[PDB]
Assembly symmetry: D2
């Protein structure tokens, strides 16, 4: 018997086969979950990547900055899962910050429009998704978002760290609203993961100094983590998201679970 046997779960954020959400979707399906997927802009690309998941899952277009996509979301989901069926889980694995807000570009040089775009996609959208999906969620349901520990400032991450701080605050309020539906809302704070974007940054896409800093940050992470950290393996992160989607953390809400090898609990 699967951990998510009989659960209907919406998974957003797949772009490539290295996306954290691809691994969340794989593990959830291995655990008996019936999935509905949401994708942004490049849907032909997303459909081909998701064809490799162990089971079939309908794909729906969702640009979190689009008011029409959000207003029609619940109707499109229920149409994909069948009338009279509701979701048991929602996975928010969406994040973006324009290049001006990250890397070698000075912190003070990011124009507000770019910061605002990044916060809209990375933080506000967590509330936006919950607003659209809570009316079609079952009691005992679970909303999970992806976080990167922003409690301390760090090189290169810059305004994305600010967006994550706002996300953690948004999550605590989403928990208040979700509670009225008998639904939990939590974040998984993951360690660094070698996604296509991350590999590009290490490769110097956002500047040499930013690349050097991010590579050093990842090395320090594995060193600190009492059980180590493998940036090339998103499976421990995917399993943690599934733990929160399950009935096994029923008294946890407005909270953050750290899937970071325990690195944030250690100084050196």
């Amino acid at each position: 018997t699967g951990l998510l046997d009989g659960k209907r779960i919406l998974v957003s954020g797949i772009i490539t086969d290295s996306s954290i959400a691809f691994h969340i979707a794989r593990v959830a399906q291995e655990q008996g979950a019936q999935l509905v997927l949401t994708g942004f802009d490049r849907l032909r690309l997303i459909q081909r990547i998701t064809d490799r998941l162990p089971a079939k899952a309908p794909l729906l277009e969702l640009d979190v900055q689009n008011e029409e996509h959000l207003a029609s979301l619940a109707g499109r989901v229920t149409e994909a899962i069948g009338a009279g069926n509701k979701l048991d889980g929602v996975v928010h694995s969406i994040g973006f910050m324009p290049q001006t807000g990250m890397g070698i570009n000075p912190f003070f040089d990011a124009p507000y429009a770019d910061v605002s775009k990044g916060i809209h996609i990375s933080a506000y959208s967590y509330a936006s998704m919950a607003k659209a999906l809570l009316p079609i969620m079952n009691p005992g349901g679970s909303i999970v978002g992806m976080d990167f520990d922003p409690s301390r400032a760090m090189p290169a991450y810059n305004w994305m760290t600010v967006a994550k701080s706002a996300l953690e605050s948004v999550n605590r309020f989403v928990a208040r609203e979700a509670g009225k539906y008998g639904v939990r809302s939590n974040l998984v704070a993951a360690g660094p993961i070698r996604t296509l974007a991350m590999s590009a940054i290490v490769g110097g896409a956002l500047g040499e100094e930013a690349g050097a800093q991010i590579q050093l940050l990842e090395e320090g992470w594995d060193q600190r983590a009492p059980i180590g950290w493998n940036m090339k393996d998103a499976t421990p992160v995917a399993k943690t998201v599934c733990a929160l989607l399950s009935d096994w953390l029923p008294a946890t809400t407005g909270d953050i679970i750290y899937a970071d090898g325990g690195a944030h609990t250690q100084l050196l």
Copy 2:
């Protein structure tokens, strides 16, 4: 298939049928775990209470303040589980603070010997148990302890809160040592639970003012918790301990999971 299918788990802290550890033991057995239990002082009492668990589990005497009990523990466990078998899980559900360190008795009036006894049992023993059990634990293993959020001072709990602050610090160091064995170490910070001791305190066993404060603390907790809090139900806490004992939080260590209805994430 059970969440803890094939896992060998040691569970300490059963005294009565309302002990949090009784519920941890029940849920773990419902989930396919094979248990070994440890009990303090009143073993005839503990054996009769544990007879009501869905499956048989050997009972071993363990006074955490006794150096001989700790030195012979691993040998006694392996004798109960069979030579060549190791533990996959350890549950520390032990806590005690002499009456002088709690309730209406003034904070400044607790003599050091009493505070020291309370910290020995409630905090140091987490390290003591890990030292005794880590040599007989399998990689991928998990040690879980019971916590009561001590980040803020609260009426009546007094020196027990101080002992919990020390426990959280001990846990982060146990995580460093346990990591070398491929073992995780975490705490479950539970909301208030109506154990025999708790009911006695509400009943005024530690003074009227302390009883009034603890009853008010519990009411505020349910009010704050976005999903509510049922002090009479230890099952959500027991399930959370099992989530940490499972393979579903594999990247979490030196950490604290809050099974408190989300009360600590809300101000009012």
Copy 3:
């Protein structure tokens, strides 16, 4: 000898005589600081209110959302303090969240444009001010911003709490940039203060339920605070801002000082 004797300090955020920044400006002048003030929109109003300060201070127009005001700020300040003189201190006491983002209006109903306006003014502007003022700041300088503890979600404050979480994150990055100039950056997290806006909210300006919640929040605050909390007295907050502007906290940066009567350190 005054605490801020010989210091040139910029103070933003005065709108009325009950503004926290009015009290910051008064105490700073009582302590020998030479001030330059910034005001938003209603400058005739601000000039008349600031006429009541114990000493004269030049007033400069500053709309933090205006790119031209920010680009000319340093030039206007240096013109007011004299060529060859730099600032020793900067006070950010600016906050705003459109009504849709606060009170009885549901959390999910705040449109992004309103949230974005609120975050621009309340969080991004802390970075904006530092970018404009750091080139005209002396080593040993200090930037202070006003915070309202957003670590936990609370009724009514809603998106303003989210903006404060973003502000705390912005502050840690401003500290990195300010450090290069030998300048500190910190926040003062104040308890609730009966400003004109706060009195209006208690009076039901943002809805009855929000008014009731905010009044209850303030009462709980004084109760929890080991030294109490007087919402009608901004002087303890003003003194704390001056402590950070002084040479008496020289090793504190990227940090938060709580001037809340110790309420955040107590559960009940």
Copy 4:
């Protein structure tokens, strides 16, 4: 006019001229405070070191583990400051952990008696001192203790970190009791300081690996700190203690002020 003009302050913890408390005492006297000093065991040594302070200060014997010294403390202080005079400030700058609880000696190998001694001196004594001194403290008074950020586990510091976690918890309760006298209670969390004991540890007194780890910890600290960290300079720490002893942080209690160059607010 001095920051502590007319204040009567008790300063414990002087052992050598590099003790943090020596610098606290110097800065306080430079700021007009009238001091009373307490010393442990080697009083002839302490008297000769304190002779170098800018002004005379009476020295009283105080072993925090001695019940008689604590019971007679208030009487001895009032005798030194004159009948009808009370203290305005108390500085707790006392810390000790037996060698078994620190360095290369394994975390699990520290016997409870040694851990208990270390917690008695380093944490319980903060409550012990407050109990003895609060009856002879004026309203508006301030108690300050010395902390080393224990929120994360770190190599070598081991059980001393556990003692600091307990100290932070003790401080929040001392704040509750001190509030009844109109007195504040706070901790100063300092960065690493090259005291005689610290230099000895870097020199390998607690083992080579511990020495290497502590030297690395200090280097990382200066690197992270946006304003840097000078382990050879206790003056910024001494000034911060004086800020808390002054009337300039009147709304801060049960709290922790970080005098660490802002290192704890930065990840890398």
